[PDB]
C-alpha cells in the first residue's frame, strides 16, 4: 500500500477543473485501478472535445504532485 496513488490523483484534480472538467475521487480512483492514467485523459479529452497531450501538460505542473511524497 503506497500512498503514491493520492499523491497523482491530487494532481488529477487540479488538471480537471484547468478545463472545467468534473472531477471525481471515486471515478477517478476506480479508473487506475482497472486502466492507467494515460488511458484516462484519452477518454475524456475524447469525450470533451480535447487533446490528450494539453491535458497532460496541465497534469506536469501540479504543485500537489511536486509537494507530496511516497512512503
Known amino acids: ?28 480512483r476506480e479508473f487506475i485501478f482497472k486502466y492507467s492514467v494515460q488511458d484516462l485523459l484519452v477518454r475524456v479529452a475524447e469525450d470533451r472535445n480535447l487533446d490528450v497531450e494539453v491535458l497532460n ?10 509537494n507530496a511524497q511516497v512512503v
Open 57 to 66: 501538460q496541465v497534469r506536469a505542473q501540479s504543485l500537489a504532485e511536486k
Open 1 to 28: 500500500l503506497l500512498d503514491s496513488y493520492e499523491a497523482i490523483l491530487s494532481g488529477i484534480e487540479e488538471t480537471f477543473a484547468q478545463f472545467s472538467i468534473p472531477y471525481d475521487k471515486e471515478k477517478v
